[PDB]
Design a binder for this molecule. Structure first.
Ligand SMILES: N[C@@H]1[C@@H](O)[C@H](O[C@@H]2O[C@H](CO)[C@@H](O[C@@H]3O[C@H](CO)[C@@H](O[C@@H]4O[C@H](CO)[C@@H](O[C@@H]5O[C@H](CO)[C@@H](O[C@@H]6O[C@H](CO)[C@@H](O)[C@H](O)[C@H]6N)[C@H](O)[C@H]5N)[C@H](O)[C@H]4N)[C@H](O)[C@H]3N)[C@H](O)[C@H]2N)[C@@H](CO)O[C@H]1O
Ligand SMILES: [Cl-]
Length: 563
């Protein structure tokens, strides 16, 4: 079961009452194609440290009397035997006909991370929170918990600026405390599974940003997850001038934001390599956007791409923009669901779709208004399927399900109203993903690190280091726990993810050997670097860029089992 491909979709609690979101509700979910639904979003309560609803009315009270609950052709009624209404009732009602679709509550997000910062301050608060998650999934019929903490990183000024008053004083400890949080959640959830005779899940949505990851020093938490969802989107957008892809798959040496770095990092494939340090591919999901970002008055570039703009796209090119002060005046971002961009192209023959064969995503360009908007289409879905099969990925997650497209029942020829275009939300790309994931078959089981099959030696190898972008300075402590001195000229090897490049060893000599998603680094010491019994020697060096961890550590051709 665990090697099955996964297609994980985020459900937006806020969409059902919003014009720009298409009034999307639970009966509009792509139930025939998704394997998991992540409900977005719950939060942490500031005073009790327990899981809490964001829009309680939407989640458990709304009766949908003014909305249309219909699946296929049949009217869907709320189950009157449940003690709650809202989205949660509709989810449980649909689950009866889709018993193998897993439902998870997602805690966090960009605007729901704030009270994680105070909850992680003490072990008792973490225990309270974790217990409250168990209580919540039992109460509301969820199959698991997804943690979307944005972000448990020491990187200053990362995450929502509204929360700097809580995140900035805590930067040095966030990663350690997050690791404790995830481990505690796993322990409590596993106990609840045994008690209930049910297999509850724990997942996390995680950063793909090298900037954020530079402030993450311990990725052990990943081993406690059923799967790790890489947020391989928001790579580019209106926060800066670089007119570039939202969600590229492959490294692009023409991405102007990274053109001088040792490799292009703002693409799924770099994050894949990063996380291979701690997980097999079959536990990693690719993040796919069904939304856009974009710019207007683009200067230079070719069809806008690789150009510059200080003005994110506005107006009809930004229907999902934030209403910061409730004027109806939206903050420019070029942010749209995919169906709205399709409708804009129906109305404007000079808004045209292009394909980038390097990054393997499409984009839309209006050559007269100089408007560039990212895009996603059948061709990029197909490229993403190829990548998923080629890399043995566990599947994909989608942010967010109301951005996929289908034909609009409320289409009005010639209308410019948001919900009267040819297209509205639908399942076109999600069904295409589901079909491709079925066709490629289950994941392969990635073999264990080879070091476990080698003869053991009682040597302990501890790899530590410090990151000062773009340089990782490593320090490896080697402790001899045998009863005989280890002569100089010993060697240690480790597998370094291809998100990073080994630069130099500060002592002795080294070699680098290609090894799949890693380079095997072999450090051969000098004859004078003897390790006495019960003694420790330290060697250092430099690596370019960052990596989730190292694997497959050997010492003198043996497995260093420590003491
Ligand atoms: N010495 C300095 C130089 O270091 C500097 O060079 C630059 O340095 C950068 C590193 O600091 C480097 O990388 C970029 O770093 C910036 C941060 O500084 C990163 O920018 C952030 O990118 C995030 C995405 O990865 C953005 O987050 C998104 O923000 C949007 C809003 O804009 C949110 O949207 C909301 O979403 C919710 C749902 O989630 C929805 O409800 C709302 O309606 C939406 N509004 C997103 O949720 C959120 N994820 C963030 O805003 C942004 N600041 C960037 O990613 C890194 N690439 C640069 O490459 C390098 N040039 C130079 C500068 O020239 O200065 C020298 O002095
Ligand atoms: Cl950020």
């Amino acid at each position: 079961s665990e090697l099955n491909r996964k297609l994980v979709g985020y459900f937006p609690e806020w969409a059902y009452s919003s014009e720009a979101q298409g009034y999307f509700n639970v009966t509009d979910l792509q139930w025939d194609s998704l394997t998991h639904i992540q409900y977005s979003f719950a939060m942490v309560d500031p005073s009790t440290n327990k899981i809490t609803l964001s829009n309680k009315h939407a989640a458990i009270e709304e009766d949908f009397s003014e909305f249309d609950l219909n699946y296929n052709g049949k009217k869907i009624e709320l189950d009157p035997s449940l003690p709650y209404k809202g989205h949660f009732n509709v989810l449980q009602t649909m689950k009866k006909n889709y018993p193998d679709v897993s439902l998870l509550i997602s805690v966090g997000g960009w605007t729901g991370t704030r009270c994680f910062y105070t909850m992680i301050d003490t072990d008792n608060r973490i225990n309270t929170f974790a217990d409250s998650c168990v209580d919540f999934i039992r109460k509301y019929g969820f199959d698991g918990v997804d943690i979307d903490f944005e972000y448990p990183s020491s990187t200053s000024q990362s995450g929502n600026p509204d929360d700097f008053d809580l995140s900035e004083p805590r930067r040095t400890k966030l990663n350690e405390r997050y690791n404790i949080l995830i481990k505690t959640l796993r322990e409590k959830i596993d106990m609840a599974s045994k008690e209930d005779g049910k297999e509850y899940l724990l997942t996390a949505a995680v950063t793909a940003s090298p900037w954020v990851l530079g402030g993450i020093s311990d990725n052990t938490y990943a081993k406690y997850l059923d799967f790790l969802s890489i947020m391989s989107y928001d790579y580019h957008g209106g926060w800066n001038e670089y007119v570039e892809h939202l969600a590229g798959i492959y490294p692009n040496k023409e991405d102007r934001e990274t053109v001088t770095q040792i490799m292009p990092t703002l693409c799924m494939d770099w994050a894949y390599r990063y996380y291979r340090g701690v997980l097999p591919a079959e536990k990693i999901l690719m993040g796919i956007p069904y939304y856009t970002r974009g710019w207007e008055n683009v200067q230079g570039g070719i069809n806008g791409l690789h150009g510059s703009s200080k003005t994110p796209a506005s107006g009809k090119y930004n229907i999902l923009g934030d209403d910061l002060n409730n004027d109806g005046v939206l903050e420019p971002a070029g942010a749209n669901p995919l169906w709205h961009v399709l409708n804009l192209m129906e109305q404007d023959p000079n808004l045209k779709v292009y394909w980038d064969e390097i990054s393997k995503v499409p984009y839309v360009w209006q050559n007269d208004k100089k408007v560039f908007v990212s895009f996603e289409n059948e061709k990029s879905i197909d490229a993403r399927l190829e990548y998923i099969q080629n890399k043995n990925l566990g599947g994909a997650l989608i942010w967010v399900m109301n951005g996929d497209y289908g034909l609009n029942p409320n289409y009005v020829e010639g209308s410019n109203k948001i919900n009267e275009g040819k297209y509205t939300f639908g399942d076109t790309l999600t069904k295409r993903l589901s079909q491709g994931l079925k066709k490629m078959g289950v994941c392969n089981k990635t073999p264990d690190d080879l070091n476990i099959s080698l003869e053991p030696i009682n040597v302990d190898v501890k790899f530590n280091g410090k990151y000062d972008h773009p340089n990782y300075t490593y320090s490896i402590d080697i402790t001899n726990y045998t009863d005989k001195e280890i002569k100089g000229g010993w060697n240690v090897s480790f597998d370094l993810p291809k998100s990073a490049v080994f630069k130099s060893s500060w002592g002795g000599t080294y070699s680098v050997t290609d090894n799949g998603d890693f380079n095997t680094i072999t450090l051969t010491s000098g004859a004078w670097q003897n390790i006495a019994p019960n003694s420790t020697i330290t060697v250092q060096g430099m690596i370019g860029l960052c990596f989730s961890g190292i694997r497959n550590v050997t010492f003198n051709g043996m497995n260093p089992i420590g003491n």
